[PDB]
From Swiss-Prot:
Binding-site residues for Mg(2+) 3, renumbered to this chain: D27, D89
Upper classification of the organism: Viruses, Riboviria, Pararnavirae, Artverviricota, Revtraviricetes
Taxonomic source organism: Human spumaretrovirus (SFVcpz(hu))
Localisation: Virion; Host nucleus; Host cytoplasm
Gene: pol
Protein name: Integrase
Amino acid sequence: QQCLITNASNKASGPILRPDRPQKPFDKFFIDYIGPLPPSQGYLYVLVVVDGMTGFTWLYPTKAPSTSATVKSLNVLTSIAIPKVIHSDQGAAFTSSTF
DNA sequence: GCGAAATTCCATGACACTACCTTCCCAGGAAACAGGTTTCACCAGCCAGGCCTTGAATGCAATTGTCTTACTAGGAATATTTGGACTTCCCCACCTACCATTCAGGTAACTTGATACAAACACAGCCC
């Protein structure tokens, strides 16, 4: 067990999966902060909410990727309509028990 | 010819300079703190009477402010003379960076120990 946890596999994973598109908009949002960018107006982080139906991006810049900076960023966007599913990454701000 | 065994094959992944940074979690405990209740005693607020200190008015005395003159020394310019700070070049010892080893201290605990505070009665010093 000194040689099992250092050598890496020479066996690639198989074919990638293409999951199907949803059949309506407002079904899957794919959200991920970008940044730290170069600063402007006291902003560094930009929430990016892509619709999984189309590609229709939504931008909601914030000061710092906290939980509450995301929550008010979607209250603008939940004013439009309500999604069923929101995908993300396992972010520092999304995995919080508050969010 | 099947199976067992000895061998060659080939598709692939990771190495490329790396740590911080942010936000949320966890956590245990604790930090007190912010919050709040409770009660007793005390310090602050209240008001007036008497006296002393301050303010003012003053007269005057010397203190101080101005004027004037003879002058001493300061400053500047000089030459020079002299006294040194820093730039320079080089080497060694000393500080550091390191690991291993160990000792000492801080926390911590249980005990002990000792002193200060709170209370009471009296004494002495100073003042009215």
